[PDB]
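Section 4.2 – Deliverable D4.2 (structural model, holo form)

The reporting period included a commitment to supply a predicted holo structure for the target in complex with zinc ion. Inputs used:
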Amino acid sequence: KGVVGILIDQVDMPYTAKGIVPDIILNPHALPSRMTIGQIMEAIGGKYAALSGKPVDATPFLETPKLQEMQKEILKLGHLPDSTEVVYDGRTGQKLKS
Amino acid sequence: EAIAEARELMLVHKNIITPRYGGPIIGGGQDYISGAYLLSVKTTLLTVEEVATILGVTDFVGELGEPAILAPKPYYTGKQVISLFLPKDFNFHGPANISKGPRACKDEICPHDSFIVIKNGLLLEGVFDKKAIGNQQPESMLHWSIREYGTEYGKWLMDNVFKMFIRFLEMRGFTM
Amino acid sequence: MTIDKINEIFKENWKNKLTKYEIARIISARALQLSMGALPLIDTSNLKSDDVISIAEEELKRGVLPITIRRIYPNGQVELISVRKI
Amino acid sequence: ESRRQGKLSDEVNVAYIATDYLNEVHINCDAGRVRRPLIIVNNGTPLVDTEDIKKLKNGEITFDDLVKQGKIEFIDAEEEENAYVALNPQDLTPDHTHLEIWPSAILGIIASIIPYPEHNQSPRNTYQSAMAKQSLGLYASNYQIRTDTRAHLLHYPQMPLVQTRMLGVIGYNDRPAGANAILAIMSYTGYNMEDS
Amino acid sequence: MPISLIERNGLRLRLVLENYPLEFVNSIRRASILYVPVMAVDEVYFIENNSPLYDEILAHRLALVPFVSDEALEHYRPPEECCDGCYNRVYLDVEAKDQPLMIYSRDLKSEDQMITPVSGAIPIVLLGSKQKISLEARLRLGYGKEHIKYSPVSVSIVRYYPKVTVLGNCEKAVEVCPEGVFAMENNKLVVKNELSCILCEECLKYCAGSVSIESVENKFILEIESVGSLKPERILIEASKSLLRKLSELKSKLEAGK
Amino acid sequence: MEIKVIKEEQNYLELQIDGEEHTIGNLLKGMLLKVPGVKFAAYSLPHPLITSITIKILTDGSISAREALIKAIELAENYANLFIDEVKKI
Amino acid sequence: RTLSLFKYGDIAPEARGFVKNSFMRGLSPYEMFFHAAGGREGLVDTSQSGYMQRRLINALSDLRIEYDGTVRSLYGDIVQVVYGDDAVHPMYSAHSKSVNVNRVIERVIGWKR
Amino acid sequence: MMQGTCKISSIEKGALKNLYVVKMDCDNDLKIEFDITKELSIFSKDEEVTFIISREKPEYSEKDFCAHGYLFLERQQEDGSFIDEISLYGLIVKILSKNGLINSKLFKMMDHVYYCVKKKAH
Amino acid sequence: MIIPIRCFTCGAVVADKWEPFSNRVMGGEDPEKVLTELGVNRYCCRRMLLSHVNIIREIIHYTRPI
Ligand code: F3S
Ligand SMILES: [Zn+2]
Ligand SMILES: [Zn+2]
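Output (structure tokens):
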């Protein structure tokens, strides 16, 4: 859960080498103490579902496809398997080091 | 009279130290600590343009001095940039929070940046983390700065150096 | 050592020093009577802010205020402190 | 056996309690008991076989037909004292008496919308259920001809790309209450710190 | 300080910029979004609306429809120098008889024939039986700095110029690169699409000694994608003209103070 | 835009510009950093909710800060004009 | 037995709530049940604290520091001859210490030590 | 104020990610090791080089390694040798000597010095 | 209710590709191939079409009288 802190225009958002811009930015510090791995898994599964056009089932104990198959298919469709992107700053144009 | 009393006795920066114990109740949080660690680590090298980008969020105007590295390329250091905001007679020796594990050496000769050394307001060793700038940490470097230079200095320091940490996280990129 | 050495140190320390409550009281009184039509005792021509509280603060910082603090000790002794150029 | 053959009511449950001191038989047939269904296995073989599944898939029989044939039974909490249940068919033993139909049927309808719920800490799964009842979407298809004291309407609802099997059963894909956002996990400008 | 064309494919334009600073190229990238005028719906006058969609929803949908504006930047007054010569009128009057009817962008009639929707197959609203709509909208030029409906592009990208060098030979590079930069030609590793490299460095953690990846310091790659209102080459010129206007105004105000 | 001077000297200038944002500030800072005689140059956007920037220039005294700003503006104008000329022939 | 999935009288670690998987690998159905059971009592987690603070406030509200250095009530009763033992405010303390002498030494000769 | 000719002996990794340690053997029973990163790594493991430590700025080109810092530490060991440390604003230069830098009256505590290493293969 | 005119992330127009995509996918074609043929290459624009729910069809039977 959270509250909206600021609204940023598309020019000021960080963009990937394809020009894609995030709709929402989440702080990495909210994850490690709450231990919600399902959210990162859902992000990867959603990117796979949008890239491949194939159904994604996340029913507990019976998930199909598995994460490794999802990552291999993400790689074959033109993206990095670990779901990371090369990102530039929209305000200055400089590439982030990570 | 009410406005004058509120401005003289209740202003925020006059109440940095809590009356429950002799310690600061105002200090760094989550991105501040990791940004300080990433900036103050000894592997961080910066160019003139990156230094100007980092210092543009502060009130700093003046001479940067010479870069720490002159050849083969001119590079600044994160410790060198941090040192611009420490008083020129401040001294501090103490361990860092990251020194819980085997990297602890308990002396100034540490290859892990686990021991903080400040001499004449120059950060020569160690990193900045929860035990140096974190809130509710008594007898920390920030606590000694506030105690020996005034709460106005603490207000100036929190409004200038803590923005640099966020800006450096923005430049470096921090994800999970 | 009248009663204890700590009490003597206390009274010697606060002999020529103003507490924060006295500063707040002086500033509030000066601002209240300055908003009522009194003439400022400083230039007030090139000051950053022209409100009464800022002028009172600047008038206290450079001693021009003819105000005296009366400290009444519990045994009846009276101490007088002047803020006019100390 | 009499209950499974249709000569007794399905509302009757029986448990046999044997101890070093107690030797009792308990029969319950009243109202208000919460029961759950299970597949009956015999000598390590469930009574639901390939032919029954084939007849179920093409629409010849239903769940009620499997119940009336003595292949699935609803048992209350006290009859289950004699039950040795297996989650999956591949861990069956001649000592087992029942088999679970669906291992994910231990959850409710709102815990059934969480993707990968077994990878999250449990209090977050509990907070999700509270927050899922406060979201805005489409609550009825005929909302424009109703007269509710307070009501909301999301203009452009989307159905989740990461799905669960229960989302299509309950009709949530036709009445959704959210949208899919491109999410980045990074520290930016300091405006997303501590739950922002 | 030249400009080299990579590809021109429909609404996309990709260029190589040499001897330009990154500050200028990023300023162009931002100005092509923020400071290029485009015709768009400003307000709508409703006479009747029985549709399932409310007046504000229909107004927003109409405002998000692109219009061809190439000839409108010389016959209409831009929002920087604020009726005839300022606004254009577009009409819509539809009705369904007995079965549901879908309203498209070809049902919008413009009083001026050079300002038309980019595509005529955009679904506006679905009408039920006997429902009707009759409205009138006014279009004016505007900048994306005011509302994103006035932006002429969709994506605007500037990225570093890559330098890919094959040192040895390894089959893992073809496997691990997400951009398809490498290929196998006669049992050896070759570079096919060097300019498609995004400097991922994923190849350096597997083919550590076989591949070298660097970026050229003085070169940059610029991608923009038009939405339909203006052609990609006009946007890049309008952005620079806006930058020149702002710079000249600032210079005049500075020189009028010393 | 509307400008005003916060603090000006022969080798220092703090200028506030209203109605401008990153597009002009970053360009001006980058152009200033390559003017000979400028020792320090930065731009600041005090609040993202306000469209206003602040320019801060420090020189060694061989050139005025205002002169350096005008030179940077001239450099940016030359780059823009050359870009316009070169885009028309691709 | 806790659940019907286990044998009568089984007290093995898995039967009584030991989870050998991680959140990265995923929990079993009964492991998920055990984890949800373990964290139930944190969901329950003030009137007593408020009452105690109110009683303290009403007991202590009339005490004042005098120009003598004495702690007295507004009715004149003496509570402490000198506040604390050295008349040092905890807000100005060096974490309960009036002076940290090691800190003073570090302030003076820390640049050569 | 302190020169020498010496040969690199080893280049290891170190505790941190991109850190590197260049160990060196000098004349007069002197040993020097200093930290570098990938940007500054311009040294091979068996080459002859020349160093200098002085309070004045030396003459350097684009092919050398020049830095300035502060001499902030000196300890004496059990055998009578000394440990000296220069901090290039974070990067540590450690010097092994038998007489020390301050004990020999060459430098003072907390002097600002210049550290330059040049290749003998001009 | 009805397909959005533009993608939420970028400003690309997606509303005019809904009818061909949905008509061809219910005809038995592969959604990824249809999306690639239509020119929808970024996953931000593909999630717009892969997750749309057509509710206006159900709502036109219950429109407010006014
Ligand atoms: S893996 Fe891929 S795109 Fe660039 S740097 Fe390495 S090649
Ligand atoms: Zn260590
Ligand atoms: Zn898109």
